[PDB]
Every structure is written in C-alpha cells, then in structure tokens.
Design a binder for this molecule. Structure first.
Ligand SMILES: NC1=N[C@H]2[C@H](COC(=O)NS(=O)(=O)O)N=C(N)N3CCC(O)(O)[C@]23N1
Length: 823
C-alpha cells in the first residue's frame, strides 16, 4: 500500500522526503510528488499523479468544483462553545422520554459527568462495559445472577494523558514542559514552563493563545477561563509604529497569505465590501481581484495576476507570486514576514500565525477602526474561518490508506507538524491532531452553508430563487411529470427538481436547490437531525373534513394509524410484560406498526435483545425461512416455496394476514388499530374471518392491563405521526402560504379542481402526496424539541429511545457537522 503526497514547493518536498525516511508506518509507504503550486497539485490528484494534500478552506471550496472534483477527508477537530457531557445529555434525554414506556435504561454518570465504565439496566439487572461515548462494548453483558463485569478505566483527558506521557513513566520530566490540569482534567488557563520560567495562556483543550507568551520577570496577560471557542480567526496585523485605521486602508501596501486563502482573501475582501471601502458589489463592476487592484497601491497576494498585487512578493524568477513556499511571502507566515520586512503596511492571515510573545511591535487592526493587542483577536478580527483539510479524489479510492497512514503516524509521534526547513510545510505548524471527517462529508457540509455561499458569492452573481415559488423535489419520473403538470397550472408558484430518492431531496433542500418534499415517517429523523422542519403534514382522516374546509380549526383526531398489540379475549393470561417467548404475528419486517414500533419497545425494555430471540414461534414475513420468525408462516395454499415471503403469496402477510395468523395459530398480532374492525363483525367474507366478532379481541396496554379494541387511542404501542412536507427553517412561512393557496385551488374542494388535482394522478399512485390525503395542514409548532413535537413523545421514545444520537442514515454525521461561521 502506498500514499503519494502532493507537495507544492521545494521546501515542502524536502520535509515530505524527510518523513519518508523518519516515519515508519508498517504496511503503508509514503511517497512525495512535487508540483509547482497548489493548483498543479489539485490537478495531479484529480489525474491520479498523487493522492492527497492539505488545503486551506478556500482551496477546499475551489477543489470541490467540477474542474478538480476533490473532497475533504481529514481535519483537526474544533469546538464552538462548552457543551454538556455526553453522559449527562443522555441522562436528560432518557429521563425526558415517555414515562409510560417503563423499564428503560438511564445511564449512570460520575462526578465529572462521564459514563461509569460499568453501565447497568435497572429493570433487567444486566450490566456491561462502555467506551467513553457510552456505547456498549459488545460481548461484555453480564446477567443479574453474576457480579458486574470488570471494565477498563476511562481514557484520560487530553491534559492528564499529555501529563502522563510528558512524565514518560519516570516521576519528574526534568527540564521539559509538563502541562498543569484542573480538577475536571482540563487545562488550567495559565501554563508555565517549569525550567525556563515562561508562562502563557491556553484554552480549555490546551491550545496556546497567541500574544500571551511571557518571559520570567514580566507580568502576564490575563488568561480567560472556560475558553471552548477554538475556531480560527482571520485577522489584520500591523506594526505599532504606523497609525492608520482599518477604514483608511485605501492606497496602502498589503501582504496576503494568498489569493485563494480564506484568511488572506475571502475574509478581508468580504469586510471591504460590507464597509463599502471597495467600489464593488457584483460581477458587473469587474472582477473582485481588479477592484482590489485599484484599492491597494502595491501588495503581495500569491496566485494573483494583476501586476501591482504581485509587486511586493520576492520569489525568484518564475517562483514570484506563486501559491508555493518557493515564494517567501506565501502563506500566513509569509504574509507576516512581508510585514516584518516592511514590504507591506498590513498583513492578512489568521490568529494561529500571530507571534506567541506578548511584548513586541505588532498589534491588530480592527474593522471598527480601532487597534488592539495580539491576544484580543476574538474581539478584533475579520471573522471566524473554516477549518482546513486533507483532500483526495471524490471517488475516495485512497481515503482508507490516507487515513490509516496519518492515524498510525500520529500514534508513533512522527514529525508531521514542524520542520527545520520552514513553517507550515505539508500541514499547518499549529495543527496538533488530524481526525477523519464524516464519510459523507463534502465541501458544503465541511465549510457550512454560510461560508460556502460567501465564497461562491465572490465568483458569480448568485441569483436567489423567489420566495413566491416552491421548487418541489421529485424522486421518480412519474412524480416529475405530475409536478410539471402542476407547474403548468400554478402560474409560477410551483417548479420541479429531480432526485433519485428522498434523502437526495433532503440534500437538495439543505443546499438551496429545492424547497420542499413530502417525507415518509422513516426519513423524518434524518430530516429533522439535518435541521429541516415540517411545514405542513398530510391529514388522512376520511371522517372529518372540517379541518380541511376551515383552516386553523381544531382537529379532534388526526386519523393516523395506531400500532396495537392484538390478542383474543379467551387468552386471558397474556399481558404486555409477559410476551417473552409467546407466539407473535407481524404484518412484515420493516412495517412501522407491525415491526419497527414493537421491535423498538422490546429493545428498549430488554437490553436490545433480538426481536428474533424474544418470541417463541412467530410469523414475520421477510425474515430468514429457517428462523423461528417464519415457523408460523403458511407459505401458499397452492404449494409451488413462497413461505415467509414478502408477498400476498404468504397467507399471513400484511394487515389482514397478521390477523389471520392470530386467529389460526397465534397468540399476539402487531397491527394497525384498523385491522380488527376491517375483518370482524362480518366485513371479510372469507371462511376464516366468517362473522368473527370485534368483541372477541382486546389490545394490550403498556402498563400490563388490557382494553377493548375500540380504545386504541389510549391503549396502543404508539400512534404514528403523519407524513410531513419539510423545508428549511427560513422557508416554512413561504411554503405554508404557497401550498395552502394551491390547495384552495386544486385540493379536494379546490375552486379550480377541474384544472388539476393535487392528490391524484393518471400517471401513477401516490405521486408527490399520498392519494388518500384529505388536505395538508400547517404544522402547529410547539415550544418543545422538534423530535418530540413531530414524532410525539411515545413514538420518539419507542423507536429512538427519545434520543438525538441515533444514526439511521450516514448523512446525519455530515449534515450535523459544526461550522466556524459569523453573524
Ligand atoms: N405540533 C403537533 N401537532 C400534532 C400533529 C398531529 O396531531 C395529532 O396526531 N393529533 S391527534 O390525532 O389528536 O393525536 N402533528 C404531529 N406530527 N404531531 C405529533 C404529536 C402531536 O400529535 O402532538 C403533533 N404535534
């Protein structure tokens, strides 16, 4: 296995070459491929000449476009603010679940708020070991009949682990820095070197605050406590011997880290434009680079083409003004060097390249026309900027080899993050750890919508779609054709987009490519986790059109299905709490009322033991034919084998089919509340149903009691939430207004329902909306968690343990990735 690293300069290639010799990662060999600039390396990776390089966030954006088709895969984790510990959040979520779902696991947290390594389930007496995230170490479960397991102690905090390593197992690390930790095991704000006498400030995860390093005998700056804001900040640095302010920058000389860098270009230009220092607003006033060319007298901006914007660079011959360390003024530390050597009056870079020392001739130029000390960048800056990242081809053919190499190299403490040859070679010298990003991350979710759009805005005039138009996302060709017919009558209120599946529709809406889509319940957890909101919902109650006639009216019964546990009156012995080992009938694997809701409750109350293992002999179509979930299944009265099959071939498949299995060879059936009334009181002519009586059956309540099948509203496993039309938070009001108006024209009582029907089509069944929808009803948003508000507390608890930590789609870690954005 090989990893070919692309280097952009002679210096970087030297450092990369040193790592080939000094860093021994077994099984994976590093190699170094030279190119002359950042852009030539991007092309080399696209072409397969190389596999990986580290890119500034601005280049991550440029590399994500069709010209290069690269994606970020690895980056240094950052923090925005202090957060609850995982264990205490989990405790709060589980304690907030539905109290009628008895016997659920509530985590046990220690005096620091972390998980005890031994976790136990009170109602079952089971215990097990957990990692730091409180996830079960599988295979450590111990029954109540035995002593609790012995579990490894929790991994130490960064500070305590860095302390232990610095002590190298020897009791005092003489002459070397030993971190000083607080009682929670985080870094004390002030750190001192035990031999040199120097002191400086660090944030809560131990990153040094620039401008605070203090030699012995001098007074230190004050160190802020509980600093969990570890985003990098764009700053403008100046010498204290000059006197101009930010608003007087016109006509000065400037040093920029680079034309494509977020801290050297996007951040300052963004502020120049907002303050109207730059006579430029759109691509009709020329290019942004040309306007900046007219603003400054002479600059060094590596990668630029305008002559005066390369005039201050000092690279020799063709190396001059190259996006490469062969230009000595390239990058953050090159721009600072350019100021230091007086080729510029101001340098544009980020806080991590500022001098560590408090005292000296440098300070910050704030956009509010004041100047402030180096250590006040959090209040004197041009914005937070995104993280930077290792990138590779979108195809990801080398992602595993790249990640494996860098994880092992860091375990072995190879010299990745410094060099005698220069600063910020290969990686930023400030980097301390590189971690894999979410597998489905791309530049949009890595940078975040705010910075992504801000960078796009410098390259093209982004025409913002109208708030009077809903772009509807369709998932198949018939849906798109029904939507084109809707657009034709809508007078411009409706437009259409196409995706392959509901999750790609969610992605389009997030990225501003569509505005709305109707989602099945099984997709709503992912949609709500990504930050979309229900705007309207499909109301399916055929017995009450009054909420559809008069909008805003009160709804007595939304009419969704209720999952129930159905048993016969004769079997008086069976209750909820003794269903273990009994015979059960399920509509089919994957059905929400017949499978997902019951499986969720069984899992919550029995330590995630398989619904397969919980019952005795069952029929649940879709299971493996050899398992005990198919033993009850009667394949086909016209024998072919079609047993336990997901078709009408299986006699026990579906709503009515699970009702058969109950009456014939069954003990309990998991069904919508409607199935019993639909097949008793002489409504199914079939022989088995005959004139079966609705009074002959009951439903099991979660409290061990029973009730007649007519009380499904108060004795159910869970009610289902309705299907929802989702959109971005800021578009809810427009989408509600447009859809409610469309519904007054083309709904079931629409004034123009002869021109178009929203809830049917000749092109197919359930296109865009379910054909049984009575109307769409505005979601009445309540002051609670949207998870509880949309799912209902019972469903949220039964299916998701009332937790925001389930991952039913690998999109969730990418769409919830946090960003370094401004207001
Ligand atoms: N905001 C809000 N309104 C409700 C409507 C459905 O309303 C009924 O289900 N009514 S019911 O039939 O009377 O139970 N939409 C939802 N997804 N929900 C789920 C929980 C909830 O019913 O409270 C509700 N949350």
């Amino acid at each position: 296995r090989h990893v070919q690293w692309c280097t952009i300069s002679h210096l970087e290639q030297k450092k990369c070459n040193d790592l080939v010799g000094s860093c021994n990662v077994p099984d994976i060999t590093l190699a170094c491929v030279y190119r002359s600039s950042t852009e030539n390396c991007m092309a080399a990776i696209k072409d397969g000449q190389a596999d990986a390089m580290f890119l500034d966030s601005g280049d991550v954006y440029k590399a994500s476009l069709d010209h290069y088709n690269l994606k970020p895969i690895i980056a240094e984790p950052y923090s925005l603010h202090r957060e609850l510990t995982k264990c205490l959040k989990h405790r709060q979520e589980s304690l907030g679940g539905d109290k009628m779902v008895k016997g659920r696991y509530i985590p046990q947290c220690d005096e620091k708020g972390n998980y005890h390594p031994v976790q136990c389930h009170a109602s079952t007496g089971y215990c097990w070991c957990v990692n730091a995230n409180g996830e079960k170490i599988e295979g450590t479960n111990t029954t109540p009949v035995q002593t609790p397991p012995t579990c490894p102690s929790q991994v130490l905090t960064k500070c305590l682990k860095e302390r232990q390593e610095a002590l190298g197992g020897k009791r005092i690390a003489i002459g070397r820095y030993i971190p000083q930790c607080d009682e929670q095991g985080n870094y004390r704000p002030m750190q001192c070197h035990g031999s040199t006498g120097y002191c400086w400030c660090v944030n809560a995860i131990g990153e040094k605050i620039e401008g605070t390093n203090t030699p012995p005998g001098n007074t230190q700056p004050t160190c802020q406590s509980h600093d969990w804001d570890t985003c990098h900040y764009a700053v403008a640095v100046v010498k204290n011997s000059s006197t101009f302010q930010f608003g007087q920058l016109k006509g000065k000389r400037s040093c920029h880290s680079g034309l494509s860098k977020t801290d050297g270009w996007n951040a300052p230009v963004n502020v120049f434009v907002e303050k109207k220092l730059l006579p430029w607003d759109g691509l009709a006033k020329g290019s942004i680079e040309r306007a900046v060319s007219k603003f400054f007298s002479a600059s060094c901006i590596p990668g630029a083409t305008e002559t005066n914007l390369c005039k201050q660079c000092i690279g020799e011959e063709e190396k001059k003004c190259k996006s490469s360390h062969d230009e000595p003024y390239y990058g953050d530390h090159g721009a600072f060097r350019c100021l230091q050597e007086d080729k510029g009056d101001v340098a544009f870079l980020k806080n991590t390249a500022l001098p560590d020392e408090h005292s000296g001739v440098y300070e910050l130029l704030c956009p509010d026309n004041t100047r402030k000390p180096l250590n006040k960048y959090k209040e004197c800056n041009l914005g937070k900027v995104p993280a930077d990242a290792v990138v590779t081809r979108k195809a990801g053919d080398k992602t595993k080899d790249i990640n494996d190499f860098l994880l092992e190299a860091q375990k072995k403490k190879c010299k990745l993050f410094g060099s005698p040859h220069g600063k910020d070679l290969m990686f930023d010298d400030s980097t301390t750890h590189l971690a894999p990003l979410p597998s489905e991350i791309d530049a949009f979710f890595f940078l975040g919508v705010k910075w992504y759009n801000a960078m796009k805005a410098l390259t093209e005039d982004v025409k913002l779609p109208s708030k009077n138009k809903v772009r509807w996302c369709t998932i198949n060709k018939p849906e798109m054709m029904k939507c084109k017919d809707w657009a034709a009558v809508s007078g411009g209120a409706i437009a259409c987009t196409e995706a392959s599946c509901p999750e790609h529709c969610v992605k389009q809406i997030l990225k501003g490519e569509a505005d709305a889509v109707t989602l099945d319940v099984q997709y709503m957890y992912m949609a709500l986790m990504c930050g979309l909101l229900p705007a309207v919902e499909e109301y399916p109650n055929k017995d009450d059109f009054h909420p559809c006639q008069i909008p805003g009216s009160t709804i007595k019964d939304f009419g969704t299905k209720r999952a129930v546990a159905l048993v016969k009156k004769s079997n008086k012995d069976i209750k909820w709490n003794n269903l273990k080992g009994k015979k059960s009938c399920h509509t089919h694997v994957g059905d929400i009322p017949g499978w997902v809701i019951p499986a969720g409750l069984i899992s919550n109350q029995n330590d995630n033991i398989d619904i397969e293992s919980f019952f005795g002999e069952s029929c649940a179509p879709g299971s493996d034919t050899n398992s005990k979930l198919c033993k009850l299944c009667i394949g086909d009265p016209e024998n072919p084998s079609t047993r336990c099959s997901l078709s009408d071939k299986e006699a026990y498949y579906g709503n009515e089919g699970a009702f058969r299995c109950l009456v014939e060879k069954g003990d309990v059936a998991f069904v919508p509340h409607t199935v019993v009334f639909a097949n008793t009181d002489g409504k199914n002519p079939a022989e088995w149903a005959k004139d079966l009586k609705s009074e002959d059956f009951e439903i099991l309540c979660l409290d061990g009691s029973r009730a007649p099948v007519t009380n499904y509203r108060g004795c159910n496993l869970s009610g289902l939430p309705p299907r929802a039309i989702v959109t971005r938070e800021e578009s809810v009001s427009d989408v509600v207004r447009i859809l409610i108006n469309q519904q007054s024209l083309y709904g079931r009582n629409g004034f123009e329902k002869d021109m178009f029907q929203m809830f049917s089509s000749a092109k197919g069944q359930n296109l865009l909306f379910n054909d049984e929808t009575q109307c769409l009803i505005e979601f009445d948003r309540q002051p609670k968690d949207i998870m509880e508000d949309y799912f209902g507390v019972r469903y949220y608890t039964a299916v998701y343990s009332a937790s925001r930590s389930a991952v039913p789609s690998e999109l969730i870690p990418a769409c919830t990735f946090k960003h370094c954005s401004n207001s």
